[model samples]
Target: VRPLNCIVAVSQNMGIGKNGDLPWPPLRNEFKYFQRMTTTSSVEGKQNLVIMGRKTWFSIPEKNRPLKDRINIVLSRELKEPPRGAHFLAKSLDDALRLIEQPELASKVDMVWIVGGSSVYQEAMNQPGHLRLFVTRIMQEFESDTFFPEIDLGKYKLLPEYPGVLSEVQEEKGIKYKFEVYEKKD
Candidate 1:
């Protein structure tokens, strides 16, 4: 199985969303970083698979649907068809992972990324082995209704730095944030 990874930006209180969308102002560079990480494939002829909850998929603007340069999988139990621009639809995170493990798709996918809504994040975190979290630590707090799940230090270890991720704090729109990576420990 390909490594299961998650990428999210969270505020001081671990808030990820307010209502149905991002709670903070747009930080272009930070968003660009998200694009780069999910789009880049380690091998030629292979692409990454990004899986997101139904709501998370719709939260993206109409023009940005399908999230360019990678395969998009939207997890939903109620939806009968893949949303207009989505590449695939699965009933659950396990279903999505199993779908990619098939020979037809296994050859084309290099990585599996879980881009979330709260429950999806929790499910992915519960998955065993080769799981990594790529989190952007927003220094400021926001009044938010949705949050990223807690990272259990007992099961995962925070790396001092990761390749292609900036170790130093970044500032944008006067908001300070830093990229952090955590990997499941053996």
Candidate 2:
């Protein structure tokens, strides 16, 4: 299985969701970065595989059901087939990885990106890899029912600067945030 990287936004309290949606308002820069990072293929004829929980798939607005230029794999044990606009369906995170690594699809896939909800993020991170996290650290805490898993810093170190990553802090809609990456140590 290929190592999966994740991109997520979290508040100061580690809160990530509220009432089935983002606790905070939209941040355009963050959205742009998401598009760029997920869709930018380093090689021709290659694309990223975006794996997400069924809930996360639904959380995306209907108008944007299928994220462009990427292969969408929705994880759902209850789902017998691929959901609308999604290219594949898996019963679990391991299933998703296995599906994408098949020879037919592996050649077309460049990287695997785990876009999330709490449970899916937790499972994906536990998989062995040089795991990488692209985190948008929100400075303020908001009322939330869901949160990101606590990462063991001893295993993953925050980079002072990562290639192709902007090191400066960002502010949007009165909220302060920064884009950061944590790479797992060998």
Candidate 3:
């Protein structure tokens, strides 16, 4: 399998969202950080692949559909057609892997990012691999119905620093947060 990176921002309680939306107001810098990581590719002509569940796919505004410069793969068993601008749709988690791992598509795909709702995140976390985790640790807690999935902390250990990632606390709108990367350890 290829390297699959999971990117998410969670509150102190590990809450990721509430009612299909972000629990906290937009953190501009954090959004830009996300854009940069997912949009970048190691190969000059290749693009990153973002695979997200249906809810997470729709949570993004229509204005941003088919997220520029990257291939958007939506996971949905219900959808008859790929959403208007979505590049691809996977009926199941296994389907997504097959789609990306296929020869013609594999070479052009530089990285896979699981951008999600709880179920999708859970799958990525449970998969047997050293998943690359990019988490923004929000310093405060918020009331949220949706949450980021829990993983075995022992399996994924924190990194002091990671290339291309900021290793410091960031502040905005009177809120404090830190960017963290955790790589799965043997």
Candidate 4:
């Protein structure tokens, strides 16, 4: 199969759960759920790398230790060590890409997604050239404290989501959501 290009979803909110499949508490913002979809789906096959800030990683429950199944890279302004079995550690988003470029991992990594809290997504969104090319927005806004960083529409071009399941969804409060995609353009 051909490699799928990088897909990003900058959530203004998130939904917390024990496991990705099992719903826990609904998140008030799009950011957390954005990371959840980015991290989990990419690992399934599209890509093998999930990058996030240190705080976001720690936010992941302890029951799901190791952050295994793919290359889990965490960014920390402070933490010096790659915790436990975390596949990779980055001080910044650039560092994460640098590690991925390492000769050893070159083959395994096809798509690299910057999962978030806020800073991580901001870093990725701001430096469009350094990060992912395509961005996906799941249009499900909620009452949220966690926020996804804003993207400069001028820097990146927004694209309509091709027809798919997101065209329909499991609804709440009369709100419906669908998957959307965007790409960086000069």
**Top model by lDDT, which number?**
1
Give the TM-score comparing model 3 with the true structure, all chains together: 0.96
**Candidate 4 Cα RMSD after full superposition onto the native fold (Å):** 6.0
TM-score on alpha carbons, each prediction: 0.97, 0.96, 0.96, 0.67
Q: Which ranges in model 2 have alpha carbons more than 4 Å from their true place?
A: none
In candidate 3, position 74 carries an lDDT of 95
Model 4 residue-pair collision total: 12
**lDDT-sorted candidate list, best first:** 1, 3, 2, 4
Instruction: List, residue by residue over 63-181, the lDDT tens digit for candidate 1.
Output: 88889989999999999999999999999888888899999987799988888988899998887778999999999999899999988898889998798888988999999999999
Instruction: Give the Å shift of residue 28 in candidate 1.
Output: 0.7
**Sorted by TM-score, highest first, which candidate order results?**
1, 3, 2, 4
Candidate 1 residue 142 Cα shift, in angstroms, is 0.5
Residue-by-residue lDDT tens digits, candidate 4, 123-180: 6666535333344334454444455555567765656553221433433344444455
Most TM-score-accurate candidate: 1
Inter-residue clash pairs, candidate 1: none
Candidate 1 runs further than 4 Å off: none
The residue-level lDDT of candidate 1 at 106 comes to 70
- Tens digit of per-residue lDDT, candidate 2, span 1-186: 265689999999999999889989988888899899888877888998799999989989999889999999999989898888999998988877777878998678998898899999899777776789999899998999999999788888998998788978888889999989998844
Q: lDDT of all the models against the reference?
A: 0.90, 0.87, 0.88, 0.53
C-alpha root-mean-square deviation, each candidate = 1.0, 1.3, 1.3, 6.0
